[PDB]
Design brief:
Chain lengths: 383, 383, 383, 383, 383
């Protein structure tokens, strides 16, 4: 099966983080340390994505790969290169200081280039072309996901997917070819301004947005479907729950071991005010189905599930007093439910498609009779 | 004087952690990083020792030596090797999935062997033969310990020692040679099934259990003896206090310099629910008398006391809101009492034998007149 | 412009930490890791500076540069070298155990020498001579600082300067050459007892005390001037606020190339008891105006402000429930105010000379319109 | 079987290197890098052992453990601590500048002590007590060695051992307790001047000399026995061949889990002048019959032979123009002969006791018809 | 005493290497690894300095600081950064492709700037201002050097110094204000084109050429003075001997703390053809008087002499077949002569001013009767 690239996932997550529900445009950000995500940020109405990462992490940004969805401003670049970041990737579309307006915006882009030159920071573009079968694979698996299939049991997917394609291309892409060349010249990408490198970057940029609109439509806003109980115990806002579930869906395409991909993400809600664009919520960990590191490949009994990787490679600890949520694309197995409950995760969001089913090596019986953790599943509103 | 080996102490502590007061058998665990204990776990009624370590530590298990008291199951082994552990030692007896019953257990043991070979971490047995004088030295010092000597002032020790020997032999040892050979064949120790490598392992396994029963009897349940106030402020359960004190007694035999060994262990009680087999309690730090690292050797003004090493080489911080207590085998000196009080440790458990004594380079006067820290000492129940 | 030496600042801060408001004398301490300050400690009436560092840091003292204001005692030296400190600088004045009295004091100093020889850590003296222009540069800038200039708007600075010169000479210096030679022979600096290496050390010691009394007088006690609100929300004690502001003033002289030096320090106040000599307050971070690490380069557009450096290279995290204070020598700019507010810093202490100004590349308009953060500025008491 | 310690072997080899045939006494030296010998030196009539190592290695002494047979003088110590050596072990009998005479010698020892104090090099004594069965094991295995058995088939061994004991103890040991007491006071070993540490060190020193005289006598100068060919190509001098064979015989006691021990050493003869005390010859590599660096568990099929270890962990390369010879205690097997011939080793010195024998997992048939390499075997002089 | 800076000495040596006797201009180069010189190169008539370093070192240029005397061309820069060099310092007077002529030269400079921008290696200028007493100190000591004093005992020094000042400033400096201003604009040094940074760089550049002309005149071509034998034996060409002696004379000012600074350099002559600008002659090692590294500090007894540092920190080995010679400013002591003779150095060049003298802790008696090593001393031609 096709496997999503690491730099393509961190780029896709950065674009998705820009769409977190809430002259200078919004910017998402992914902070990656040792090829593991250690933070997902968004630009609040007060601060920037590159400045929130400095507040949240500080000197811990040393030797970190930062993936912005817009080129960071001069103020936001000097602070992160001083922190110690070694790689700053960005989406080659309109930067943070909107060039589609100004003298200040155009002059600021020049300052970034001078700052990029005399500094050792690898401010570059890590965007990569996808595999030919990747876009077909994502569309095929999205229609079979636990969320589209749940609605089917109640044509709509393609209709909703087209709207996301329109919405995510007037936001993450410069439709005009002449406008994009101006931006690429202004942000120090002259070698990418000439064909076929201009068309290669543009095609791949459109290629990744199609994948994002395909994944984002797999957890759709449609006919009042959301995450609700089957009976803290309070549900998240539906916009946040769907956004965090798409993050798990994106991680599900990093799966390497099984033909069916599972991805999980852990989010916790602070009890105090926060400077991030996500609000009180912050990112705890993420993971996907994979073999143990080192190629440790009965074939399913040597895999680390999505929930287990999230609890293993987590940056922030689970605060007992806080409300911490986990978003698993599928029903947690009998192996992961004790770990999720044991780790102190208060709420579980998943798709109750495999619930109650016993297989040869995996079982989904503990999820249904789980006590102590609130389980929200994709379904119609009981009210 | 004989000095306990590092791998022998981590093996003994793992066996002792299995006896923490509270198909698949209980397992103790010692997580060691940079030759320093950074966690003492036990198998809860819900989770496993290997899975609890993943929850408590996560990715911090990287480059860690884990000492189980039973061979971890395939589920627990795949997670810890994924986290990045370095050396998975285990007690070469009945594994976690009990072989003394089943087809599922035998298949699971095979699954570990395939995972052991595919993976990189060294799943080995670090059990070592004891020094010839070690067992005699341990018995000699245990009769002169601050707890047995306190009892005599108010023949019994050997009577209690024999009972522990019987109890710990039917638990940590396979008495039947036929049964043990089946286990060693099943758990991949084929080259330890033939003599003299079969009697060597069996003798050493029995040799360490004799040492454990000797140390465990030095803090005995006898004539309603426990840790009570000499007159939070609430005492720990007597089973927990004695268990944590034997941990300090085990560390006291790593004392390299001074003729009398003192060991200390710090435990803290969380205010929330926990997934560990020890309950709300968790391990903060441990230490013993030793010269400053790097062989920095009066001969007593260059020694780092047991309390000071525990405060120095501690994994978890002392939470001011939590109830944290320290178990020191001997009365804390006038040098360690301010450090224990200053660090925020709420309770002190020790043997008030040296209390009030004024030696040349060491004094025990500040312990008696200590304000702000609850002091529990080995004595009769006042009520 | 003159730039303060890295080891001269850590030496000056250690002397200043000894003056934190509250047989054995007080001792200040600076813990430096990777050339960044990770702790500022004083000596409480119960504990020592070298023992408080062990409590606050523990094993985190590994590979740390410790700058004491007095030579640590044998008890304090053995604990820090056990932790893993590599370099222990000290002020070559009277040590912690006062030699200006005793047989116990003189024997303890000899014990340190054996410990210093036996151990590996570099117990040395890093005091360095100042630049010729440095001493009058500090005096010139101090008279033009935001605090002396504020008073003049309401011939006095030199009277304060002389008083602190007298106060800091009878405290940090041994005026008698006979007494100092005895101390230097006792504390193992026998090669510094002979000229010209005896007058060189004494001259350097006098130059730093002259510089310290110059900086300390820049935030004077003249009249009723203090840090009051420009109408938690409660002000710090005036002695603490002035002391913490002088720390920022000392950091302001590490400014890389900018003509005007700005320094910031962040302090937080815990709600529980503490063992430190500073009380409940602990040190969060420090910084100064400087270009991004790696010598990055309109010239002001590529500089990291004092507040931004403090937020980046901070050891402790900003606890939302605690009281956090930042002391910036100049008025925070429009770049730093969102970061200080975003980071959760509850109170701002700063000057108000530049408030309301609109320069070309910098503005000070958001400070006046700041909501949610208490602002304290150098002014007379409104009451 | 008793396995010789690393620091005991490097100490034993340093003593043996002092006996290389050729006010200030001759000194042997072993240079160890990554626990592998990278040089064997002796004090020439012109230079010192510590100065020859600097010439032969230079900056390569960085992070190396040097094992002298006498405490290096001030000139030798300052040059090797400059190079960057890690540990400088020595035999605590009599330093290079002999104290059994002078004011200059006594003054120099004090200079070494001051140089040790202010430097970070671990100038220590790594001498360790032997295992109880070690001395008996060496004695019994020496009568069954390939060289004593050869003479037997043509009571003498004990007679040769006794005279070696007299010679080696008179040279490597200070017989007078008072005289040795003075030396340990002079060379900064006061803590070893008090019983039982004075008797422990003295007993351990005699234990290693007894072992050395046992190993040295195993390749005895009895009658006209030596290493002769079986009718370059010229034989080494018999004193050199016997000395180098004992080196290969001392390595034989590092054997890992194999009842019969095999050790190898490779020496090459330079075509030009040399500053070493060994003459034109230099040390190429050493190795003992042992398992791979990890574990390899028919059990003989996974053990690395002595010749293979020497060719693997060799410091100097085999120059085709030079005359290089290898000394192996046992006859090279059919597996090692192609490697020795292939590596370019010109001459082989061995014991032809098990030559021509074909065992199950090992054969010795290729040695008899080895073409291109001159084979010298322990035998009586043909003429 | 003033001490020459590291980056300030490697700059001086690079300029001096340009003057090695033999459109595009000759360029000297210093390759520095771990703050130790590992190569001195000059631009041959067929190759460039940056290309000879690649041939001589290859991949060993990784993590090396290269100090060119002219900015390397685009061809030379791309290969050295491909090798993995760390810093490329240069003398900001005129690049390799001379700008004082062309369109090709001006275009080439732009290519270097683009190459430096998108690459990672620090192409910077490490030139530093001299200490105030430095220039006077060198002028005073040079008149008292072994070579000026030798001629004096046979006013001239100042006359030769002025000629070197006239020659070296015409070559290493751009006298015209406008021409140097244009070059700094062309080579991407616009930040140094504005006062006072234009006058600062020009003044410091003049200070070093004055320093170089002062040192280069300390070994003058006055009358028929040269290095001739006191009583291979063949001497070097007088131009080469004087040039190599000035290298030693330059390192004499790197001496840690001695009024009598001593510097040494070792050179060897290959028997075959070479691509370097120095011919078959290549650089072996260099050194100066200094205390042992590691804070080491009868003061002269703990000083590693210039010859000893040269042998310790040599890069190339002393090949017996080649002709290798050492240049020491002072007469080798009785301690360094055995090491120079032992290391295999064939010839010694020195100043026989203090030959035969016997001080307290140093003697110069062994140099007079040194057999086996050819000795050449500064004297009049015996013909
Ligand atoms: Zn921005
Ligand atoms: Zn699962
Ligand atoms: Zn388990
Ligand atoms: Zn104590
Ligand atoms: Zn102290
Ligand atoms: Zn600012
Ligand atoms: Zn010597
Ligand atoms: Zn063999
Ligand atoms: Zn070139
Ligand atoms: Zn010398």
């Amino acid at each position: 099966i096709p496997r999503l690239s690491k730099v393509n996932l961190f780029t896709l997550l950065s674009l998705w983080m820009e769409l977190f529900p809430a002259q200078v445009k919004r910017t998402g950000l992914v902070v990656v340390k040792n090829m593991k995500i250690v933070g997902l940020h968004c630009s609040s109405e007060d601060l920037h994505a590159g400045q929130i990462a400095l507040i949240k992490h500080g000197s811990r940004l040393k030797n970190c790969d930062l993936y912005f969805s817009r080129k960071p401003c001069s103020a936001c670049l000097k602070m992160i290169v001083n922190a110690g970041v070694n790689r700053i990737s960005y989406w080659p579309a309109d930067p943070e200081i909107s060039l589609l307006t100004s003298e200040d915006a155009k002059l600021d882009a020049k300052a970034v280039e001078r700052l990029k030159s005399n500094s050792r920071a690898h401010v570059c573009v890590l965007l990569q072309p996808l595999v030919c079968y990747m876009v077909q694979f994502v569309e095929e698996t999205s229609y079979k996901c636990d969320f589209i299939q749940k609605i089917t049991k109640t044509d709509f997917y393609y209709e909703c997917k087209q709207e996301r394609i329109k919405e995510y291309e007037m936001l993450f892409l410069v439709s005009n070819e002449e406008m994009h060349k101006q931006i690429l010249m202004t942000i120090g990408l002259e070698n990418l301004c000439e064909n076929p490198y201009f068309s290669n970057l543009r095609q791949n940029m459109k290629d990744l947005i199609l994948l994002l609109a395909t994944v984002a439509s797999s957890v759709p806003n449609f006919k009042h479907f959301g995450f609700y109980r089957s009976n803290h115990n309070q549900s998240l806002p539906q916009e946040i729950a769907r956004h965090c579930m798409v993050q798990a869906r994106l991680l599900a395409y990093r799966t390497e071991d099984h033909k069916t991909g599972v991805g999980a993400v852990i989010w916790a809600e602070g009890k105090s005010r926060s400077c991030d664009g996500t609000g009180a919520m912050y990112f705890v960990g993420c993971g996907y189905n994979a073999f143990p590191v080192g190629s440790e490949y009965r074939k399913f009994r040597y895999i680390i599930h999505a929930a287990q990787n999230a609890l293993t490679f987590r940056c922030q600890e689970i605060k007992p007093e806080e409300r911490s949520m986990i978003f698993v694309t599928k029903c947690p197995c009998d192996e992961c439910v004790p770990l999720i409950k044991g780790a102190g995760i208060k709420q579980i969001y998943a798709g109750d498609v495999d619930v109650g089913k016993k297989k040869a090596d995996i079982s989904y019986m503990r999820f249904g009779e789980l006590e102590g953790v609130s389980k929200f599943t994709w379904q119609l509103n009981p009210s």
